Write an enzyme that holds these catalytic residues in place. Sequence first.
Site, PDB file in Angstrom:
ATOM      1  N   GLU C 155      -0.223  -1.886   0.738  1.00 29.29           N
ATOM      2  CA  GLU C 155       1.302  -1.555   0.504  1.00 29.29           C
ATOM      3  C   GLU C 155       1.969  -2.268  -0.280  1.00 29.29           C
ATOM      4  O   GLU C 155       3.004  -3.045   0.163  1.00 29.29           O
ATOM      5  CB  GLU C 155       2.140  -1.688   1.754  1.00 29.29           C
ATOM      6  CG  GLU C 155       1.690  -0.190   2.856  1.00 29.29           C
ATOM      7  CD  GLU C 155       1.554  -0.506   4.157  1.00 29.29           C
ATOM      8  OE1 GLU C 155       2.118  -1.473   4.738  1.00 29.29           O
ATOM      9  OE2 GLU C 155       0.954   0.659   4.761  1.00 29.29           O
ATOM     10  N   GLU C 253      -3.958   5.494   4.884  1.00 28.19           N
ATOM     11  CA  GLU C 253      -3.184   4.699   6.539  1.00 28.19           C
ATOM     12  C   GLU C 253      -2.762   6.070   6.951  1.00 28.19           C
ATOM     13  O   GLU C 253      -1.581   6.535   6.498  1.00 28.19           O
ATOM     14  CB  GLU C 253      -3.063   4.381   6.844  1.00 28.19           C
ATOM     15  CG  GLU C 253      -3.918   2.977   6.354  1.00 28.19           C
ATOM     16  CD  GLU C 253      -3.526   1.116   6.021  1.00 28.19           C
ATOM     17  OE1 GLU C 253      -2.000   1.417   6.810  1.00 28.19           O
ATOM     18  OE2 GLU C 253      -3.769   0.481   5.499  1.00 28.19           O
TER      19      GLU C 253
END
Lengths: 384, 384, 384
Positions: C155, C253
């Site tokens: 991320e 995710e």
Amino acid sequence: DIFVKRVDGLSKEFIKGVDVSSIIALEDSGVKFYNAAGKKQDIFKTLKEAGINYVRVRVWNDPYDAKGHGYGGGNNDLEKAIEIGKRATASGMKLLVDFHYSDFWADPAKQRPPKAWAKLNFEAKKKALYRFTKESLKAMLKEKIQVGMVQIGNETNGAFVGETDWAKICELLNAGSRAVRETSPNILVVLHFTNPETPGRYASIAKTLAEHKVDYDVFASSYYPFWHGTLANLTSVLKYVANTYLKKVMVAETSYPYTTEDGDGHENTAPKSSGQTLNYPITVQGQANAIRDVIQAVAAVGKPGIGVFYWEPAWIPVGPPEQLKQNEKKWEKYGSGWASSFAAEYDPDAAMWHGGSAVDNQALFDFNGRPLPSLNVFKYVDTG
Amino acid sequence: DIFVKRVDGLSKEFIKGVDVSSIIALEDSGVKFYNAAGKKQDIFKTLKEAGINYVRVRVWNDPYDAKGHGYGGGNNDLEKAIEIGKRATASGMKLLVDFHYSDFWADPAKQRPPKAWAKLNFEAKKKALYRFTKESLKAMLKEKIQVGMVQIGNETNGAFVGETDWAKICELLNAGSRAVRETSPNILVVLHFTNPETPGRYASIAKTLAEHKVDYDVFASSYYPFWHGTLANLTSVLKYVANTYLKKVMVAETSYPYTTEDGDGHENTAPKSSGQTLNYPITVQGQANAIRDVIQAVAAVGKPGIGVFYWEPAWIPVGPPEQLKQNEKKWEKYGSGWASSFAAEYDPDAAMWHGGSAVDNQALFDFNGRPLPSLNVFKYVDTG
Amino acid sequence: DIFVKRVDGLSKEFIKGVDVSSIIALEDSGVKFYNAAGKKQDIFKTLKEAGINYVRVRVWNDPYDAKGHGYGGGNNDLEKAIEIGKRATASGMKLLVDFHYSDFWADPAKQRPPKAWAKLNFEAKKKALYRFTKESLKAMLKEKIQVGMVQIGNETNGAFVGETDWAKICELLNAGSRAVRETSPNILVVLHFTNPETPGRYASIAKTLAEHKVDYDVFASSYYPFWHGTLANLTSVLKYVANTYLKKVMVAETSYPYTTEDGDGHENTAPKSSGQTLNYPITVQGQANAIRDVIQAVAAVGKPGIGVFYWEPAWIPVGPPEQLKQNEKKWEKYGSGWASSFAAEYDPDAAMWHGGSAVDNQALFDFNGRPLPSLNVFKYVDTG
Ligand SMILES: [Ca+2]
Ligand SMILES: [Ca+2]
Ligand SMILES: [Ca+2]
């Protein structure tokens, strides 16, 4: 003690209402409501003497669990709505039936279908809504209850009985309207939405209802002053809808806190430090002036603006904060709290925070059942 | 221990200041300050040595309840400001008088009028603000306090003494500005706004201040790095105002944490997991780099950017976290907390969360009064 | 018990993956995993039998403190990844190496450089990223591990190994890609971003990556349904990137709670009433339907959608919640939780909240180690 400024332009017929849907379970838990003198007096008597012409009740299709233990929130069903409407008609007040179309709370996040309706297809869910509405109103009018309004949903901001499509949502609304319109031509069809602060939301909703030809009479809005924007927005957005789409407007839910204190041991929703705009002192005057100004904003829309409803004006403590174990036992048995353990199966938020009233400090009565001075604001808007 | 990168463009007179308004309440509660060697030393001696040229003080009109009990937050009134301004002037430090024009904390959410001005009409409020400013500055001047700046309000982001109208707000602002301008032509008029991150806010604020013909000399911002966006923003939004509206600019409040720990038993405001952008490590070096980089951002405006004030560099714990009950006594009795219970009448937040300092981990002094190595950032920004 | 709707568009080599990076520390804390019959069975066996074809592991360069005390989060390093990857290849599963290039959790807010790289210059940090990628993947590939995917950063939304400048971020991304490219042509270079709901973000990032000539094969998104918006956004934004820049898309995710309940005494991360969009019931079926829906959103991209990885499908509790002191010891001494106190030096959020699992209600295994019906979603997505 309390003086509020006169609202300009209030009709004689202006809807000064309260949603007392928690009354029965409070009363089933031994809450007692008095008068200013301290003599026992039915809340609906006191309400009449204060100028309230209307009562609003929430109906859940099965606010109970499998073994019959109630979800909470007053376990509001048709039976309790029928009692409340009976009690309201006796005191000379018209009723509003806020159909959640859910076995528990319906908000913009949680618009779950009833358990019975969960397994149905869109077509069959549509006819159950129609029948539930039709049959429920019919038993109400058999018991000679004056219904001036029926609400098709609660804060249906993009969801309604499990549906997020506006096209499916509009079709469901028209089924409620059809039931209402078949029960009586003179029961107004109310549509309820919240977050008026969000720019363009109420214009887009109203278009989408018009483009999908929903029959509604009142476009209603929640304006809780700490979460839902300036007073000017309310008037402006409500004006747009009424003026552009030739509809009536009203506020279905408002409330402001009078104390920073808690009366039952379960945290109340306001005041809070971070998420809320608190523009009126947390006293009984500040309360009254917020109720006043919300009545003014509806009025400033025009002849379209027809009323303001306060929400839970007496979710007072079932017991003092120290007696929590005793209070918890009442909340679970009679659902005198906002939710009970038995709602954990249906509402995720209940499992975590089951308890009492989060609005006992935003009520217009004191912790011991005697009315506060802010309850006289419904007279004072005409006088001063 | 600590080093920092030099800042180019620092004028000899660049304002390197600290708002130490808690000092009197902390001192009255038994907090004692030391030097680096370890021997006892007045905070203004230590502070002068570190290179600070300015001290900032908050003034609340009556920061006390009816029976004389302080609201907390240092119980900051004219008397405490006069002490601070004398002590500052002894140590070679000019003073900045920040008038909240309230009886407690004034922020964008809370700009409650003083209790005495609460019952006044607009025209009287405007007259009292002038008089309070003129009288209060006069007392300080009579005591030969050197005052270089005066703030007309604290983070007046669309509120000021119970007013939400920018026309009315500017009128009230001009009242203070007049008193400052009558007292001396050499006391700069600071106006204080916050949330620089919001796109367009400082540009629109400055425009309203020009349209409504407010007299101010300095446009001040708050820049806490965890809440208020990039360093590039600060410089750009402060520059725009400076060159467009021909005003000087500065940072009035800045802070950063050096520890994750709590030293007094009241939860601290930063660091936090959810709401804060922490880009520097929570270390004494991390603190020092944050400060240096806010000093560079202001100096990157150019000759308009005139300084940086650190906010509460010494709200150190009145007692260890395990001495909380003794601390609660001092917090209540001397105002050594952020707010005491006696503010619950004026500030809703105090009733819920009264207690001690939430900025003790953001101080440039350690829990036991001994200066941290980061206190020399004001020195090092020039040497390197 | 559970049924799900089939997904059209599903290759035979569509990636049905799980991030089981918590496995060694939980196993080192005596957590035991069983089959559906109550009979102990390796998690990877159960995982293989459930249709799962891929495992994802997270590599922290030093997930430990000064004295070797592990930071938590599974105390995940190259050794733990080689074990997990070995066990993955034995059960027929390919591996994904998510390099945080940090000694602990890497997210949009926290992208801290590794302690060893923290004092390095930019250029040295580029070699170090390169060697670390090269040598870490070299050791893996010497142990038979089938690596099909390497992720450069976690991320990396505007920050990566200490840098907040997209130019320096991109250069660092090209360092890891080279070492993957130099390791093998067939291993896939993944770049990982989150918050797809924010308008423009993924399209903006994708240009910058192309404008700065980063070599990547997959544009990977975090899609936790309670924070990251509509399924149509996911498909749209992933579509755009894949069609506009000829890249591949996947969800790296995703997770959804099956119970409101906690299993280990440490508050879990969802469900939460306050701030999340929960549009599926908090039941095993709702969990299953969420995972299906994120598979269909990736499927709907086209042949660019290459798979979905469920995150920590088995971070089950070390012990029942009443056993808190006994639990803390395991979490603290085996890194069985999200973080430990030793991490407070590196990640501030650890000081405040160090403890156990916040995903134990989002696991596809129950609290006692047995599989839940929803683990079979990966089978039923092709069948029905
Ligand atoms: Ca309560
Ligand atoms: Ca503290
Ligand atoms: Ca947990």
